[PDB]
Amino acid sequence: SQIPRLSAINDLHKIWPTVEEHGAAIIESFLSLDIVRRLNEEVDPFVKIEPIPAAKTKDHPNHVLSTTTRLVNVLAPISKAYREDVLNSKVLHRICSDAFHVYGDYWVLMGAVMELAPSNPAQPLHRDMRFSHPIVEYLKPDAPATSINFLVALSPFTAENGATHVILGSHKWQNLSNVSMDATVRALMNPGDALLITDSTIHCGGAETTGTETRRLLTITMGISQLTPLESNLAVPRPVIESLTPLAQRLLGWASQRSAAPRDIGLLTIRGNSIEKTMNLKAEQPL
Numbered sequence: 001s002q003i004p005r006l007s008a009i010n011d012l013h014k015i016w017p018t019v020e021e022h023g024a025a026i027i028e029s030f031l032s033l034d035i036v037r038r039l040n041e042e043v044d045p046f047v048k049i050e051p052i053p054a055a056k057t058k059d060h061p062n063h064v065l066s067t068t069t070r071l072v073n074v075l076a077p078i079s080k081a082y083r084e085d086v087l088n089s090k091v092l093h094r095i096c097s098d099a100f101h102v103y104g105d106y107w108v109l110m111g112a113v114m115e116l117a118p119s120n121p122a123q124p125l126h127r128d129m130r131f132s133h134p135i136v137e138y139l140k141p142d143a144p145a146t147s148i149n150f151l152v153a154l155s156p157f158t159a160e161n162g163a164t165h166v167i168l169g170s171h172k173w174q175n176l177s178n179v180s181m182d183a184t185v186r187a188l189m190n191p192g193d194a195l196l197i198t199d200s201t202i203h204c205g206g207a208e209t210t211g212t213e214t215r216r217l218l219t220i221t222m223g224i225s226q227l228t229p230l231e232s233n234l235a236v237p238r239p240v241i242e243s244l245t246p247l248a249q250r251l252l253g254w255a256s257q258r259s260a261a262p263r264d265i266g267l268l269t270i271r272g273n274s275i276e277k278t279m280n281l282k283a284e285q286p287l
Protein backbone atom coordinates (compact mmCIF):
# COMPACT_ATOMS: atom_id res chain seq x y z
CA SER A 1 0.00 0.00 0.00
CA GLN A 2 1.41 3.36 -1.13
CA ILE A 3 1.08 6.83 0.42
CA PRO A 4 -2.31 8.31 -0.59
CA ARG A 5 -1.95 11.26 -2.95
CA LEU A 6 -4.42 14.15 -2.88
CA SER A 7 -5.10 17.33 -4.83
CA ALA A 8 -4.59 20.48 -2.83
CA ILE A 9 -7.53 22.00 -4.61
CA ASN A 10 -10.09 19.37 -5.26
CA ASP A 11 -9.41 16.94 -2.42
CA LEU A 12 -8.94 19.63 0.25
CA HIS A 13 -11.51 18.21 2.68
CA LYS A 14 -10.00 14.79 2.46
CA ILE A 15 -6.45 15.65 3.41
CA TRP A 16 -6.60 15.68 7.16
CA PRO A 17 -8.98 12.66 7.33
CA THR A 18 -6.50 10.79 5.13
CA VAL A 19 -3.59 11.59 7.44
CA GLU A 20 -5.62 10.87 10.52
CA GLU A 21 -6.36 7.38 9.25
CA HIS A 22 -3.13 6.36 7.50
CA GLY A 23 -0.51 8.61 9.13
CA ALA A 24 0.69 10.20 5.88
CA ALA A 25 -0.54 11.76 2.64
CA ILE A 26 1.03 13.54 -0.25
CA ILE A 27 -0.46 16.92 -1.17
CA GLU A 28 0.24 17.34 -4.87
CA SER A 29 1.17 20.92 -5.77
CA PHE A 30 0.97 22.20 -2.19
CA LEU A 31 3.16 25.16 -3.15
CA SER A 32 3.19 26.49 -6.70
CA LEU A 33 6.39 26.17 -8.69
CA ASP A 34 6.74 29.89 -8.52
CA ILE A 35 6.62 30.08 -4.73
CA VAL A 36 9.19 27.27 -4.73
CA ARG A 37 11.48 29.26 -7.02
CA ARG A 38 11.27 32.39 -4.94
CA LEU A 39 11.77 30.62 -1.65
CA ASN A 40 14.79 28.79 -3.03
CA GLU A 41 16.30 32.07 -4.21
CA GLU A 42 15.68 33.77 -0.95
CA VAL A 43 17.14 31.09 1.32
CA ASP A 44 20.05 30.04 -1.01
CA PRO A 45 22.79 32.24 0.50
CA PHE A 46 21.73 31.46 4.07
CA VAL A 47 21.89 27.73 3.32
CA LYS A 48 25.38 28.16 1.96
CA ILE A 49 26.77 29.97 4.99
CA GLU A 50 25.09 27.56 7.48
CA PRO A 51 27.63 25.36 9.35
CA ILE A 52 27.22 21.77 10.52
CA PRO A 53 24.21 21.20 12.84
CA ALA A 54 26.49 20.71 15.88
CA ALA A 55 28.98 23.40 14.98
CA LYS A 56 31.17 24.53 17.91
CA THR A 57 30.10 28.07 17.48
CA LYS A 58 26.47 27.21 18.39
CA ASP A 59 25.24 27.27 21.97
CA HIS A 60 22.29 25.01 21.05
CA PRO A 61 24.06 22.49 18.78
CA ASN A 62 21.94 19.85 17.05
CA HIS A 63 23.71 16.54 17.72
CA VAL A 64 21.08 14.39 15.94
CA LEU A 65 21.21 15.57 12.31
CA SER A 66 23.97 14.17 10.09
CA THR A 67 26.98 16.28 9.33
CA THR A 68 25.77 16.32 5.74
CA THR A 69 22.59 18.18 6.59
CA ARG A 70 22.17 21.95 6.70
CA LEU A 71 19.09 23.30 8.51
CA VAL A 72 18.07 26.97 8.38
CA ASN A 73 15.09 28.02 10.48
CA VAL A 74 13.56 31.39 11.48
CA LEU A 75 12.73 31.99 7.84
CA ALA A 76 10.49 35.05 8.19
CA PRO A 77 13.32 37.63 8.20
CA ILE A 78 14.96 35.89 5.32
CA SER A 79 12.14 35.17 2.96
CA LYS A 80 9.22 37.11 1.57
CA ALA A 81 7.72 34.05 -0.11
CA TYR A 82 7.73 32.22 3.24
CA ARG A 83 6.27 34.95 5.42
CA GLU A 84 3.67 35.98 2.88
CA ASP A 85 2.69 33.05 0.73
CA VAL A 86 3.56 30.14 2.93
CA LEU A 87 2.42 31.47 6.31
CA ASN A 88 -0.93 32.37 4.70
CA SER A 89 -1.49 29.13 2.73
CA LYS A 90 -5.20 28.40 2.61
CA VAL A 91 -4.48 24.76 2.21
CA LEU A 92 -2.22 24.75 5.26
CA HIS A 93 -4.74 26.55 7.43
CA ARG A 94 -7.69 24.36 6.48
CA ILE A 95 -5.67 21.26 7.32
CA CYS A 96 -4.39 22.74 10.60
CA SER A 97 -7.83 23.85 11.73
CA ASP A 98 -9.18 20.40 10.77
CA ALA A 99 -6.42 18.74 12.78
CA PHE A 100 -6.27 20.93 15.88
CA HIS A 101 -9.83 22.03 16.47
CA VAL A 102 -10.17 19.91 19.57
CA TYR A 103 -7.23 21.81 21.16
CA GLY A 104 -7.60 25.40 19.91
CA ASP A 105 -5.21 27.76 18.11
CA TYR A 106 -2.07 26.45 16.39
CA TRP A 107 1.20 28.10 15.41
CA VAL A 108 4.55 27.30 13.78
CA LEU A 109 6.69 25.10 15.99
CA MET A 110 9.39 25.25 13.30
CA GLY A 111 9.67 26.31 9.67
CA ALA A 112 13.04 25.27 8.31
CA VAL A 113 14.80 24.64 5.02
CA MET A 114 16.78 21.39 5.12
CA GLU A 115 19.39 20.69 2.45
CA LEU A 116 21.04 17.28 2.17
CA ALA A 117 24.47 16.93 0.58
CA PRO A 118 25.10 14.24 -2.04
CA SER A 119 25.47 10.80 -0.43
CA ASN A 120 23.58 11.89 2.70
CA PRO A 121 22.80 8.67 4.62
CA ALA A 122 19.25 7.73 5.52
CA GLN A 123 18.04 8.82 8.92
CA PRO A 124 17.10 6.24 11.54
CA LEU A 125 13.35 5.62 11.58
CA HIS A 126 11.83 7.94 14.14
CA ARG A 127 8.95 10.00 15.47
CA ASP A 128 9.36 13.77 15.68
CA MET A 129 9.35 15.91 18.87
CA ARG A 130 11.34 13.52 21.08
CA PHE A 131 14.41 15.75 21.27
CA SER A 132 12.47 18.86 22.29
CA HIS A 133 9.09 17.97 23.88
CA PRO A 134 9.37 15.00 26.26
CA ILE A 135 5.82 15.85 27.38
CA VAL A 136 4.45 14.41 24.12
CA GLU A 137 5.57 10.91 25.15
CA TYR A 138 3.34 11.10 28.21
CA LEU A 139 0.14 11.68 26.23
CA LYS A 140 -2.44 8.93 26.17
CA PRO A 141 -2.01 6.84 23.03
CA ASP A 142 -5.26 7.98 21.57
CA ALA A 143 -4.90 11.66 22.20
CA PRO A 144 -5.29 13.71 19.03
CA ALA A 145 -1.99 14.68 17.46
CA THR A 146 -0.62 17.89 18.94
CA SER A 147 1.71 18.66 16.00
CA ILE A 148 1.96 17.69 12.33
CA ASN A 149 4.81 18.10 9.83
CA PHE A 150 4.60 19.38 6.23
CA LEU A 151 7.68 18.13 4.36
CA VAL A 152 7.57 20.25 1.19
CA ALA A 153 9.82 19.22 -1.69
CA LEU A 154 11.92 22.16 -2.88
CA SER A 155 13.58 19.84 -5.40
CA PRO A 156 12.68 16.39 -6.76
CA PHE A 157 12.20 13.48 -4.33
CA THR A 158 13.23 10.23 -6.06
CA ALA A 159 13.94 6.76 -4.68
CA GLU A 160 17.42 7.27 -5.92
CA ASN A 161 18.18 10.58 -4.21
CA GLY A 162 16.71 9.72 -0.79
CA ALA A 163 12.97 10.43 -0.85
CA THR A 164 11.38 10.15 2.59
CA HIS A 165 10.32 6.80 4.07
CA VAL A 166 7.10 6.43 6.07
CA ILE A 167 5.42 3.46 7.75
CA LEU A 168 1.71 3.73 6.99
CA GLY A 169 -0.42 3.24 10.09
CA SER A 170 2.56 3.61 12.45
CA HIS A 171 1.13 6.77 14.04
CA LYS A 172 -1.23 4.36 15.88
CA TRP A 173 1.44 1.82 16.85
CA GLN A 174 2.18 1.28 20.50
CA ASN A 175 4.53 -1.74 20.35
CA LEU A 176 7.50 -0.99 18.06
CA SER A 177 8.57 -4.50 17.23
CA ASN A 178 7.92 -4.38 13.56
CA VAL A 179 9.75 -1.19 12.94
CA SER A 180 12.00 -1.80 10.02
CA MET A 181 12.78 -0.36 6.64
CA ASP A 182 10.96 -3.42 5.26
CA ALA A 183 7.71 -1.80 6.37
CA THR A 184 8.19 1.56 4.62
CA VAL A 185 6.96 3.15 1.42
CA ARG A 186 8.48 6.17 -0.31
CA ALA A 187 7.25 9.74 -0.81
CA LEU A 188 8.07 10.41 -4.46
CA MET A 189 7.42 14.05 -5.08
CA ASN A 190 7.91 16.88 -7.54
CA PRO A 191 8.93 20.33 -6.28
CA GLY A 192 5.98 21.91 -4.50
CA ASP A 193 4.44 18.61 -3.49
CA ALA A 194 4.20 18.05 0.28
CA LEU A 195 4.31 14.98 2.51
CA LEU A 196 2.10 15.46 5.57
CA ILE A 197 2.74 13.28 8.64
CA THR A 198 1.82 13.54 12.31
CA ASP A 199 4.15 13.61 15.31
CA SER A 200 3.52 9.85 15.76
CA THR A 201 4.22 8.78 12.18
CA ILE A 202 7.42 6.75 11.98
CA HIS A 203 9.52 8.01 9.06
CA CYS A 204 13.03 8.81 7.96
CA GLY A 205 14.86 10.74 5.29
CA GLY A 206 16.22 8.37 2.69
CA ALA A 207 19.76 7.46 1.64
CA GLU A 208 21.12 9.59 -1.20
CA THR A 209 22.65 7.09 -3.68
CA THR A 210 23.49 9.09 -6.83
CA GLY A 211 26.45 10.85 -5.23
CA THR A 212 25.56 14.01 -7.19
CA GLU A 213 22.05 15.27 -6.35
CA THR A 214 21.45 17.87 -3.63
CA ARG A 215 17.94 17.38 -2.20
CA ARG A 216 16.23 20.28 -0.41
CA LEU A 217 12.95 20.56 1.47
CA LEU A 218 10.90 22.97 3.56
CA THR A 219 9.74 21.33 6.80
CA ILE A 220 6.85 23.15 8.50
CA THR A 221 5.98 21.72 11.92
CA MET A 222 2.59 23.09 12.91
CA GLY A 223 1.49 22.52 16.51
CA ILE A 224 -1.08 23.60 19.04
CA SER A 225 -0.31 27.01 20.60
CA GLN A 226 -0.14 25.28 23.98
CA LEU A 227 3.27 23.82 22.98
CA THR A 228 6.45 25.89 22.86
CA PRO A 229 8.05 26.33 19.41
CA LEU A 230 11.47 24.91 18.66
CA GLU A 231 12.42 28.31 17.16
CA SER A 232 12.06 31.94 18.27
CA ASN A 233 10.94 34.97 16.26
CA LEU A 234 11.67 37.32 19.16
CA ALA A 235 14.61 38.84 17.24
CA VAL A 236 12.76 39.44 14.00
CA PRO A 237 12.62 43.21 13.28
CA ARG A 238 9.37 44.89 14.14
CA PRO A 239 9.07 46.38 10.65
CA VAL A 240 9.12 42.86 9.24
CA ILE A 241 6.54 41.62 11.76
CA GLU A 242 4.28 44.57 11.03
CA SER A 243 4.39 43.74 7.29
CA LEU A 244 2.62 40.40 7.98
CA THR A 245 -1.05 39.48 8.16
CA PRO A 246 -2.58 39.15 11.65
CA LEU A 247 -2.70 35.41 11.03
CA ALA A 248 1.02 35.20 10.15
CA GLN A 249 1.84 37.28 13.24
CA ARG A 250 0.02 34.81 15.49
CA LEU A 251 1.82 31.86 13.85
CA LEU A 252 5.15 33.49 14.72
CA GLY A 253 4.32 34.19 18.38
CA TRP A 254 3.61 37.90 17.83
CA ALA A 255 0.01 37.69 19.08
CA SER A 256 -1.86 36.13 21.94
CA GLN A 257 -3.37 32.67 21.44
CA ARG A 258 -6.63 30.93 22.38
CA SER A 259 -7.48 27.41 23.54
CA ALA A 260 -10.68 25.58 22.68
CA ALA A 261 -11.90 25.41 26.30
CA PRO A 262 -15.50 26.77 26.44
CA ARG A 263 -14.49 29.63 28.79
CA ASP A 264 -10.93 29.92 27.46
CA ILE A 265 -8.84 32.46 29.35
CA GLY A 266 -6.18 32.56 26.61
CA LEU A 267 -2.41 32.19 26.26
CA LEU A 268 0.29 34.89 26.20
CA THR A 269 -2.16 37.52 27.42
CA ILE A 270 -1.45 40.75 29.29
CA ARG A 271 -3.82 41.59 32.16
CA GLY A 272 -6.77 40.47 30.07
CA ASN A 273 -5.65 42.03 26.77
CA SER A 274 -3.78 40.61 23.79
CA ILE A 275 -0.14 41.16 22.88
CA GLU A 276 -1.23 42.89 19.71
CA LYS A 277 -3.79 45.15 21.40
CA THR A 278 -1.25 46.03 24.13
CA MET A 279 1.63 46.77 21.84
CA ASN A 280 -0.52 48.49 19.22
CA LEU A 281 0.91 46.10 16.68
CA LYS A 282 0.28 47.09 13.13
CA ALA A 283 -0.26 44.54 10.38
CA GLU A 284 0.00 44.51 6.60
CA GLN A 285 2.26 47.52 6.48
CA PRO A 286 4.60 47.32 3.57
CA LEU A 287 8.29 47.72 4.27
Ligand SMILES: CN1C(=O)c2ccccc2NC(=O)[C@@]12O[C@H]2c1ccccc1
Pocket residue numbers: 062064065110112123124125126127128129130131132219221
Ligand atom coordinates in the same frame (compact mmCIF):
# COMPACT_ATOMS: atom_id res chain seq x y z
C1 LIG B 1 16.61 16.17 15.48
N1 LIG B 1 15.38 16.49 14.74
C2 LIG B 1 15.35 17.64 13.95
O1 LIG B 1 16.36 18.30 13.96
C3 LIG B 1 14.24 18.06 13.17
C4 LIG B 1 14.42 18.66 11.91
C5 LIG B 1 13.38 19.10 11.09
C6 LIG B 1 12.02 18.95 11.50
C7 LIG B 1 11.85 18.33 12.77
C8 LIG B 1 12.88 17.90 13.61
N2 LIG B 1 12.47 17.27 14.81
C9 LIG B 1 13.05 16.11 15.37
O2 LIG B 1 12.54 15.66 16.35
C10 LIG B 1 14.23 15.52 14.83
O3 LIG B 1 13.13 14.52 12.78
C11 LIG B 1 14.13 14.10 14.46
C12 LIG B 1 15.18 13.10 13.99
C13 LIG B 1 15.37 11.86 14.58
C14 LIG B 1 16.36 11.02 14.10
C15 LIG B 1 17.19 11.44 13.07
C16 LIG B 1 17.02 12.69 12.49
C17 LIG B 1 16.01 13.54 12.97
Ligand SMILES: [Fe+3]
Pocket residue numbers: 126127128203
Ligand atom coordinates in the same frame (compact mmCIF):
# COMPACT_ATOMS: atom_id res chain seq x y z
FE1 LIG C 1 11.61 13.75 11.21
